[PDB]
Amino acid sequence: MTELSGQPPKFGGSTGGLLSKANREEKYAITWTSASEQVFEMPTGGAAIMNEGENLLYLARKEQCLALGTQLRTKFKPKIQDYKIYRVYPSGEVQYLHPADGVFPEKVNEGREAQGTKTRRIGQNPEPVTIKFSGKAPYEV
Amino acid sequence: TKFPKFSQDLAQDPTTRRIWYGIATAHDFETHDGMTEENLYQKIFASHFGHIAIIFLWTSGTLFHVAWQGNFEQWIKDPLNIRPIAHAIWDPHFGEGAVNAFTQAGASNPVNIAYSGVYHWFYTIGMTTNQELYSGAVFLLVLASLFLFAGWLHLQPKFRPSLAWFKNAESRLNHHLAGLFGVSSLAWAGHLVHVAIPEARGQHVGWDNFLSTPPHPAGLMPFFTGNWGVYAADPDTAGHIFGTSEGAGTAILTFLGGFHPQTESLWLTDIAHHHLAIAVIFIIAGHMYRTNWGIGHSIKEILNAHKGPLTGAGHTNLYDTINNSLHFQLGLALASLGVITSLVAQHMYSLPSYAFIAQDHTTQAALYTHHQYIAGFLMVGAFAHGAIFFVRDYDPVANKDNVLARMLEHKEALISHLSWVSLFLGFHTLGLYVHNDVVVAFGTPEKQILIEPVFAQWIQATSGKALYGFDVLLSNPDSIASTTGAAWLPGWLDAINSGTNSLFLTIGPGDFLVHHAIALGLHTTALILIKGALDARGSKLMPDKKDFGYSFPCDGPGRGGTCDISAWDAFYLAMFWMLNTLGWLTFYWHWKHLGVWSGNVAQFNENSTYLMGWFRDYLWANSAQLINGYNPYGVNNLSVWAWMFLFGHLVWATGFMFLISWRGYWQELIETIVWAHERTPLANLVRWKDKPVALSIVQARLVGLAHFTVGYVLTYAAFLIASTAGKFG
Amino acid sequence: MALSDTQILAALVVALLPAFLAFRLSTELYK
Amino acid sequence: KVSVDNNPVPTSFEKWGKPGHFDRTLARGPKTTTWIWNLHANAHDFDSQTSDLEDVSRKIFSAHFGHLAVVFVWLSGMYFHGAKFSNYEGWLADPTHIKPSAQVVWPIVGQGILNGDVGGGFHGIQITSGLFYLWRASGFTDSYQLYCTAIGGLVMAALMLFAGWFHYHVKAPKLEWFQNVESMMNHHLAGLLGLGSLGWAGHQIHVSMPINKLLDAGVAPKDIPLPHEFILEPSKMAELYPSFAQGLTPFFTLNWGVYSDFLTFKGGLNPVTGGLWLSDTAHHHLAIAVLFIIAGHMYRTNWGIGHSMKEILEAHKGPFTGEGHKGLYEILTTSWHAQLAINLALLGSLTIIVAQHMYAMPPYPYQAIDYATQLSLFTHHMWIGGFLIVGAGAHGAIFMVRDYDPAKNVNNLLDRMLRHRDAIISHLNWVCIFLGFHSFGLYIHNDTMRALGRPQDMFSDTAIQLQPIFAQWVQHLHTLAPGATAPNALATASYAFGGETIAVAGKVAMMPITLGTADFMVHHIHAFTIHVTALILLKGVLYARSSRLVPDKANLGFRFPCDGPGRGGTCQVSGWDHVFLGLFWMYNSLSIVIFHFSWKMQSDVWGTVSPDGSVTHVTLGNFAQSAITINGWLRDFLWAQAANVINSYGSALSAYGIMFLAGHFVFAFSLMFLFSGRGYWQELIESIVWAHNKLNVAPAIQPRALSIIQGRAVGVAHYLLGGIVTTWAFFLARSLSIG
Amino acid sequence: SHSVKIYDTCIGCTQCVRACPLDVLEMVPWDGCKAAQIASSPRTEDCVGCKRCETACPTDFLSIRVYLGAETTRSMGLAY
Amino acid sequence: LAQASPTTAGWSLSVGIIMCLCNVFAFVIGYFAIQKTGKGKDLALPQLASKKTFGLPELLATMSFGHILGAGMVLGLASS
Amino acid sequence: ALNRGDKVRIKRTESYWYGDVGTVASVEKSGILYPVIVRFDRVNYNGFSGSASGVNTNNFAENELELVQ
Ligand SMILES: CC1=C(/C=C/C(C)=C\C=C\C(C)=C\C=C\C=C(C)\C=C\C=C(C)\C=C\C2=C(C)CCCC2(C)C)C(C)(C)CCC1
Ligand code: SF4
Numbered sequence A: 001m002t003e004l005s006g007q008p009p010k011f012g013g014s015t016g017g018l019l020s021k022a023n024r025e026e027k028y029a030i031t032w033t034s035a036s037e038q039v040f041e042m043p044t045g046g047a048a049i050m051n052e053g054e055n056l057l058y059l060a061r062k063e064q065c066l067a068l069g070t071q072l073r074t075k076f077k078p079k080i081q082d083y084k085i086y087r088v089y090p091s092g093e094v095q096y097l098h099p100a101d102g103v104f105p106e107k108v109n110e111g112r113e114a115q116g117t118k119t120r121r122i123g124q125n126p127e128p129v130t131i132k133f134s135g136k137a138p139y140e141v
Numbered sequence B: 001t002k003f004p005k006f007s008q009d010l011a012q013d014p015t016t017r018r019i020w021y022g023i024a025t026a027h028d029f030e031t032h033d034g035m036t037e038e039n040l041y042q043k044i045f046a047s048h049f050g051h052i053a054i055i056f057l058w059t060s061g062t063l064f065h066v067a068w069q070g071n072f073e074q075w076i077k078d079p080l081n082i083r084p085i086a087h088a089i090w091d092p093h094f095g096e097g098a099v100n101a102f103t104q105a106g107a108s109n110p111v112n113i114a115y116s117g118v119y120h121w122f123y124t125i126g127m128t129t130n131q132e133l134y135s136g137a138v139f140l141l142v143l144a145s146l147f148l149f150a151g152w153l154h155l156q157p158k159f160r161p162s163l164a165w166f167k168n169a170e171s172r173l174n175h176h177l178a179g180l181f182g183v184s185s186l187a188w189a190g191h192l193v194h195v196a197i198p199e200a201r202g203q204h205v206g207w208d209n210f211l212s213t214p215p216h217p218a219g220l221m222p223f224f225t226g227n228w229g230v231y232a233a234d235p236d237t238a239g240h241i242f243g244t245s246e247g248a249g250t251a252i253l254t255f256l257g258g259f260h261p262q263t264e265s266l267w268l269t270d271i272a273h274h275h276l277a278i279a280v281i282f283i284i285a286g287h288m289y290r291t292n293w294g295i296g297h298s299i300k301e302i303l304n305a306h307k308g309p310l311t312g313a314g315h316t317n318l319y320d321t322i323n324n325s326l327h328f329q330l331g332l333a334l335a336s337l338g339v340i341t342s343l344v345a346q347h348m349y350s351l352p353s354y355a356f357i358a359q360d361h362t363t364q365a366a367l368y369t370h371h372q373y374i375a376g377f378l379m380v381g382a383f384a385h386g387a388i389f390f391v392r393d394y395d396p397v398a399n400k401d402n403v404l405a406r407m408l409e410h411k412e413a414l415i416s417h418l419s420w421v422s423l424f425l426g427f428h429t430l431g432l433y434v435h436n437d438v439v440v441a442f443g444t445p446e447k448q449i450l451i452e453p454v455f456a457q458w459i460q461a462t463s464g465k466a467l468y469g470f471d472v473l474l475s476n477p478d479s480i481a482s483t484t485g486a487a488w489l490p491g492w493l494d495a496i497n498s499g500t501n502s503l504f505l506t507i508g509p510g511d512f513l514v515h516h517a518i519a520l521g522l523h524t525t526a527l528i529l530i531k532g533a534l535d536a537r538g539s540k541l542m543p544d545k546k547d548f549g550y551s552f553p554c555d556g557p558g559r560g561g562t563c564d565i566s567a568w569d570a571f572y573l574a575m576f577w578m579l580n581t582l583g584w585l586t587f588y589w590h591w592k593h594l595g596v597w598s599g600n601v602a603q604f605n606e607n608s609t610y611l612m613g614w615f616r617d618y619l620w621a622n623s624a625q626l627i628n629g630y631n632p633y634g635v636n637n638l639s640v641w642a643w644m645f646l647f648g649h650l651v652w653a654t655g656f657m658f659l660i661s662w663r664g665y666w667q668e669l670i671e672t673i674v675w676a677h678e679r680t681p682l683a684n685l686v687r688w689k690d691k692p693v694a695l696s697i698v699q700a701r702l703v704g705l706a707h708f709t710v711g712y713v714l715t716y717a718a719f720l721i722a723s724t725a726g727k728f729g
Numbered sequence C: 001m002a003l004s005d006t007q008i009l010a011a012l013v014v015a016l017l018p019a020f021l022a023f024r025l026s027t028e029l030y031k
Numbered sequence D: 001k002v003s004v005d006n007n008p009v010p011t012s013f014e015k016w017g018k019p020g021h022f023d024r025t026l027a028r029g030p031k032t033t034t035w036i037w038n039l040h041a042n043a044h045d046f047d048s049q050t051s052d053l054e055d056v057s058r059k060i061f062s063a064h065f066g067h068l069a070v071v072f073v074w075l076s077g078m079y080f081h082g083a084k085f086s087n088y089e090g091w092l093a094d095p096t097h098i099k100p101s102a103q104v105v106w107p108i109v110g111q112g113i114l115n116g117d118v119g120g121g122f123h124g125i126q127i128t129s130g131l132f133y134l135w136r137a138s139g140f141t142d143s144y145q146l147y148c149t150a151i152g153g154l155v156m157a158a159l160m161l162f163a164g165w166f167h168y169h170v171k172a173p174k175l176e177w178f179q180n181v182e183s184m185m186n187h188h189l190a191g192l193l194g195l196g197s198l199g200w201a202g203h204q205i206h207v208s209m210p211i212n213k214l215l216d217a218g219v220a221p222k223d224i225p226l227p228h229e230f231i232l233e234p235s236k237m238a239e240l241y242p243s244f245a246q247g248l249t250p251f252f253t254l255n256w257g258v259y260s261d262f263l264t265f266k267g268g269l270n271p272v273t274g275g276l277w278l279s280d281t282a283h284h285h286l287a288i289a290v291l292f293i294i295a296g297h298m299y300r301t302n303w304g305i306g307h308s309m310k311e312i313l314e315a316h317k318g319p320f321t322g323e324g325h326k327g328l329y330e331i332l333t334t335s336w337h338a339q340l341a342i343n344l345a346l347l348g349s350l351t352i353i354v355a356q357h358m359y360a361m362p363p364y365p366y367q368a369i370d371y372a373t374q375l376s377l378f379t380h381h382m383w384i385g386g387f388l389i390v391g392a393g394a395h396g397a398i399f400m401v402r403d404y405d406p407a408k409n410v411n412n413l414l415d416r417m418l419r420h421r422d423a424i425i426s427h428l429n430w431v432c433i434f435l436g437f438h439s440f441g442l443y444i445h446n447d448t449m450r451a452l453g454r455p456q457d458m459f460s461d462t463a464i465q466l467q468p469i470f471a472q473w474v475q476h477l478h479t480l481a482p483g484a485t486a487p488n489a490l491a492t493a494s495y496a497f498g499g500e501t502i503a504v505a506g507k508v509a510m511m512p513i514t515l516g517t518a519d520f521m522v523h524h525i526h527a528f529t530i531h532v533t534a535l536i537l538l539k540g541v542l543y544a545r546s547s548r549l550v551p552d553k554a555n556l557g558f559r560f561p562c563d564g565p566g567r568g569g570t571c572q573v574s575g576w577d578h579v580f581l582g583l584f585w586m587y588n589s590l591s592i593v594i595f596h597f598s599w600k601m602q603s604d605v606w607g608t609v610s611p612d613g614s615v616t617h618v619t620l621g622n623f624a625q626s627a628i629t630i631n632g633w634l635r636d637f638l639w640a641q642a643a644n645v646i647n648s649y650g651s652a653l654s655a656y657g658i659m660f661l662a663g664h665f666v667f668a669f670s671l672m673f674l675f676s677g678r679g680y681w682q683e684l685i686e687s688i689v690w691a692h693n694k695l696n697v698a699p700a701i702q703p704r705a706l707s708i709i710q711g712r713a714v715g716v717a718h719y720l721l722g723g724i725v726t727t728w729a730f731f732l733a734r735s736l737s738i739g
Numbered sequence E: 001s002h003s004v005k006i007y008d009t010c011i012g013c014t015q016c017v018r019a020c021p022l023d024v025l026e027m028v029p030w031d032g033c034k035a036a037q038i039a040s041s042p043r044t045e046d047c048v049g050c051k052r053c054e055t056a057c058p059t060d061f062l063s064i065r066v067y068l069g070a071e072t073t074r075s076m077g078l079a080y
Numbered sequence F: 001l002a003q004a005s006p007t008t009a010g011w012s013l014s015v016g017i018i019m020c021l022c023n024v025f026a027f028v029i030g031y032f033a034i035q036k037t038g039k040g041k042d043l044a045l046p047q048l049a050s051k052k053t054f055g056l057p058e059l060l061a062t063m064s065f066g067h068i069l070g071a072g073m074v075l076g077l078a079s080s
Numbered sequence G: 001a002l003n004r005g006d007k008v009r010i011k012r013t014e015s016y017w018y019g020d021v022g023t024v025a026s027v028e029k030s031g032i033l034y035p036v037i038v039r040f041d042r043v044n045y046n047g048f049s050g051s052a053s054g055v056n057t058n059n060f061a062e063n064e065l066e067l068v069q
Helices: A020-024 A062-073 B017-024 B037-068 B072-077 B096-102 B118-125 B130-153 B163-167 B169-180 B182-201 B268-285 B299-305 B326-348 B361-392 B403-409 B411-441 B454-462 B489-496 B509-534 B567-598 B602-607 B611-618 B621-627 B639-660 B663-679 B697-727 C005-028 D034-041 D053-084 D088-092 D131-138 D143-169 D181-215 D227-232 D234-240 D278-295 D309-314 D328-334 D336-358 D371-401 D413-419 D421-452 D469-484 D517-542 D575-603 D631-642 D654-675 D679-695 D708-736 E015-019 F016-031 F056-077
Strands: A027-034 A039-041 A047-049 A053-059 A084-088 A094-098 D004-006 D101-103 D123-126 D171-173 D508-510 E004-006 E026-029 E037-040 E064-066 G007-010 G021-027 G036-039 G057-060 G065-067
Touching: A020 A027, A027 A062, A039 A062, A053 A062, A062 A084, B017 B697, B037 B118, B037 B130, B037 B163, B037 C005, B072 B118, B072 B130, B096 D421, B118 B182, B130 C005, B169 B182, B169 B268, B182 B268, B326 B361, B361 B509, B361 B567, B361 B697, B403 B411, B411 B509, B411 B611, B411 D654, B411 D679, B454 B509, B509 B567, B509 D679, B567 B602, B567 B611, B567 B697, B567 D654, B567 D679, B602 B611, B611 B621, B611 D654, B621 B639, B621 B697, B621 D631, B639 B697, B639 D421, B639 D631, B639 D654, B663 D421, B663 D575, D053 D101, D053 D131, D053 D143, D053 D171, D053 D336, D088 D131, D088 D143, D101 D123, D131 D181, D143 D171, D181 D227, D181 D234, D181 D278, D309 D328, D328 D336, D336 D371, D371 D517, D371 D575, D371 D708, D413 D421, D421 D517, D421 D631, D517 D575, D575 D631, D575 D708, D631 D708, D654 D708, E004 E037, E015 E026, F016 F056, G007 G036
Parallel strands: none
Antiparallel strands: A027 A053, A027 A084, A039 A047, A084 A094, D004 D171, E004 E064, E026 E037, G007 G021, G007 G065, G021 G036, G036 G057
């Protein structure tokens, strides 16, 4: 949370990456620890070279960061499970995203509430004329 | 707030789809937030008054144009061999060749020949001068201003009507049957009695003499006491000449029938007597229900007491649905308007009621296909709004075991059997045509299949025709219905058996085949709209159609693929079928009347059985005078129609744009273009305030369909007007 | 027969007022 | 260095039962009707079924052998059709008077009307492929020889089938024989491209020269006997051309001057027959034979001398390029798809070259007599080229999806491509906008000006001229060239560049083609359409792996419809749909080029020539005034030339009109597939299923809808076929009745 | 935001959380199934509507449903 | 006509000063063109001073090149 | 309530498999929401675009099925 320790990967730079929204509204970042030096592909186009130790890389959307993360899971023979996702604001604040608890959402850990979990079947949705001329919708209620 | 203001859901994003959808949903008042019955009905009433204002101002504008820049009185001097004028042309880009090719009909400025056919209307009502047309224009203008002022007046807080006033159905029906349809027809009947009949016979009626001159030598008391035959004493004979008095009696009400022997028109006495009789019948019909007196009927009692043994619950509790669902009654109203406009179109060519309208073929053809396209549009919209009613306003608990519940139960068999009728009819129509095609391709027309439409000649003969010789029940004097002694028999029997009018044309096998093609288009389009409506609340692919709304893009690549699943997409595939069925109708009508007007009916009687003459005799040969609107030598008056023809062709392909290619590729392209705008020097000093993006799937589909429609109608209108004007100028 | 310039100006000055009161209607119907 | 294996997969009959055993999920059976389309879809995609290159490459080899077998069956059938059931001798006795024919029709349902009077005492249907001119140039004069060719081709097609069965089922080579691409290149430049050139050089020297040299004089075809008694008897060569009597001694002593009697550099055309000089083609084939035999000694295979591809690809690297072409050899000797894209692209462009050299320099005798064979041959070769080049784009895209490895291409050229793909698409969009506004805008302006009838500010010869000075300058240079810069060419390279009118018996063959402003605007239209097609296929290749709309789309595959209605909508993001629209753009561009070809050479170079020196075109020279606009394009080319199509009925050409109407029907039926989606008709099919369940005649295999990509495929197929068949009907119907 | 709702007919196959590439679903304990695990969506304001979730689950008219509502350029999927 | 007129082999000048020195130059090139010579199937066992020293395929390659280069010499030299 | 091997008919009306019969597979412990796992012979719509096969097994409860045998 303090600072993003690492190094930009050995790359020749790409013109298909960050845009003015990166310095204007928000932009993304991802860090990981590499067991050994090898080569990967960066989701905005091209192949980059990671280095052993901490690596720092910046992106602009969540799709790119999670595609890269799934690549570092399911491409390399020594599996990497040490990638964290960060978002930075131009005001200088940083925020952690995932995994917030520290374990993947594929499995189950305690200390968690369940929300958006309605206890009714498909046909037990309220029929729309009882919601007619109200601010809500049948899917919300 | 930021535009659009009426929904915070559309004011939360910087994308340009916000702008597109803010243009898109400005009339969907139900989707608006903070929305009740009171606000909705008040905006309804305001928008209705605004539309009536648009109607009357449009009529005032066209009337002012035909008054000022037209050639009305020089057409009064001779009404047959002079083309009318719509308005002059103000365009600085005209070279002198086009100026010489457009300044015609005795004018000094370049003008356009009017094909709207309002000249015959203003003649047959009797607007003999331009000053009177100016008075009419200013009168409808101040009437439109009156509706504007009333529309603003009713939206004050003190004059906003209550919910129950809009709810009171019985008073609305009694008023609209009596005080809208009856007394207006009485007024128009009086207008024909006291203005149109004397101006037709020649004697002048001004704005200071009508209170003095009587419309009949006898008074009102023969109408009162015992003898209405005084008004049916001296009709205008067959030797009558319009605008003068030789062979002209002074009867106002008679029903001799037939046509006008001079100009092939309906007698104005027939129209006046007819309007008066319809006025009587609607004034009687306007007193059905109880309003405030206790005498009459109630909608709820009649609609609930009609039960059934095997119907189910009959029609119970429907009144609560139709009165509390605007979409249902809107669909009924639009369906009634569509069928009545189809009847307008298909009755105006056969039994016209205007002087010299049977000669100017361009106006007749244009007006027929005008009202026919209007019919198609309005009543496919009726079907679409019925589908929207099923989406949004159906009540399962209020309509338990209702007739609509039975409809949703047997919708499967209904859709299946629309499909069966469509396939049977289409297979045999196409098979008959292609067998005729292959047979005449080898030079042996004796093996063609020419099915005589026996029922068509049967109804022709029982309606009065004696050419086919079936002589059943009307033309034979031996039947009991011939010696009825009615006053329409000689005029009608003259009208049917005279080979110079378009009424009850001679029918051949090509008419049988093309009528089967029309019935095919009908049944296909009906299948499309019915399965779009009846399956809008359930499908084994997606029974959650009521949850998502009415117009949604898809439901994803899962479950095998869900593209084009909404009822909006059913309308999307419906519109092409509507346009095609209208097209088949209009090609058949135009080719048949070209054959009749040319006098060479044999080419239609022989070449219509096989596609060759459709594609060659009509679609190829009649296009020759179209395209020569500008030869490399010079131009003529048909330049604008040909250039608009090519214009509509380009519109058709430029909508076939959106009708082929979908979103994601276009999104990648426009995103790369955004990157181009980003890194370039001397162009970062200005940045957009609204984010650019590709159109949505539903919006792209809509704009492709709209382009298809406008290009289609533009090309057909241009070809029809130009070819009909070229052949019979 | 002949037209007059005063007729065209009279039509224009009677047609001005539906435009003004329709502007007022569009102003009031924005809410 | 060969390495083979014995009996890798033995023959059986049981695998033909239970079809679909190649895949793992298609073998359960017909549980739904989509399984049939899945079976037909992946029946040739052998790459994704197995893993290693070994067995799949054996399958490819056997598949090539099957393809050579089937094309050999087709060629043997065509030779037998031309042999027994044709008019080859009756046509060969005369020249321009009698139209040739190579097909008869059974009179069954009135088809004898189609079997019209072709001329020369026969009733049938007219040929237009041009095989008669080929057989006259080769030296065919008897039906028994053609029957021998047919039976030999059929039996060696059976030989090819046996060879394929052997090479897959008995002896299959390893990988190690395949990557030896140096031996591939050396043998293909040496053996295939060289021995055929030498063989046809011998055929033209020995057979074509005396046959045509006596046939142009006026000798009847049944007077002279066969070429074998020529090759036995050298005195006929000696009495015809005295250079044969000197023997092969001047060849070996390099005194080739005496050989110029029959090995010439005449150039131009043949005024007797309208084709090219056969001596010129013999000299051509010998020269290209020498060139290819020299070219087949580039590469190192087993004896030290030559070159290696790895070294030469490492040897090139630039200051602006980086490390250079390292890595191309692995990805281009490992993935079949990259090489397929290369060969398909160059084959498509080569076919375009073939047609563009056929039309202006007719190589075969009597080709320029009838315009139907010329026009039809040109447009057919162009359509083949368009199909092949779009397929090359498709397979380059699928290579970038499937077989590309990001690890072995660090800082490579493909890395730079995927690095500035956004820039390449950007600047190609800008040139697309440029040629769109500045070429079609001229036509819109010209049509608007002609709509006002003011030609003083038009774009024409009689108005503001956009004169193609470069093409006219190169034409003038080609006219001046054979006198000054080509000393050993007495005539010109062609009269199509410019020169004097060359006529033939009765008709005209080729005149110089003047280039006005209309051709300038047309060439700009061409460059614009080619740029659009290049844009869409180039993006479909480059954006096929990753993009910042969806980054993980390569994990899905190559053939996927969409990624849901999210992100605003992701319909047609994959490269398959890029190809699906590229087919439409190919269709549009080639329709324009063949319309311009037909109208320009119907207006300027063809017609009837009078003996006094004047010519008379069929359209009387309207291209300089009616092709400048677009409404004139609609009337003077489409309406004017459709009359021969739509007035041929009851005559001998009713079939062309029937195909014309059927092609319009197929085009209209394609809109089925293009416009609507899937769920609408899957719902409709389900209602039909309920109806059939009511009768208890429900099918065991459950009926389902076509998939979205399947619907797009069938749609572009029907649209494209409808366009091709109606264009074919119009072209043959117009250009056959010209006479 | 693209609202996502999950109903009470979940088995617990955990393909539902496995397929979504935006890390919005999460798998929470429960007691009404054999797996004793129902899925949930605690971060709904960053799923874009890709609807791969609706393809993932093999139950008949699957427990999870996504709905397209008020959109934001955060959830519209742009790089600018 | 004016074609490039060739002559027969005079066998005194046309073969000696033209292509024999060209074969000599081909041997000179073969001294400084082939990076790797001696691994052919036959190694050309009878070595010599400077003529048959490296190997068979180098010898045939340089002799074929001498032939083609001398043919070019005698054709492009005689009568321009 | 139902045992293994029962040929049972379903009446949910919100499923594709309405008006169908088939064999129940297994019943798990009491207190669970949907105990009755049924096996059919047809297939529903499940799968990606152009998928080879969907699913044929789903679990329901007692209060919407009807035993026939
Ligand atoms: C979508 C929907 C819907 C629908 C609508 C519609 C569209 C309707 C219609 C309909 C129609 C469209 C109708 C029509 C009709 C007519 C008829 C049915 C008729 C008849 C018959 C008869 C009986 C006749 C008689 C006669 C004769 C015999 C001849 C002469 C004349 C007379 C009259 C005499 C609704 C909204 C409701 C609801 C929801 C869904
Ligand atoms: S909703 Fe379906 S896919 Fe998601 S966890 Fe539950 S059973 Fe699995």
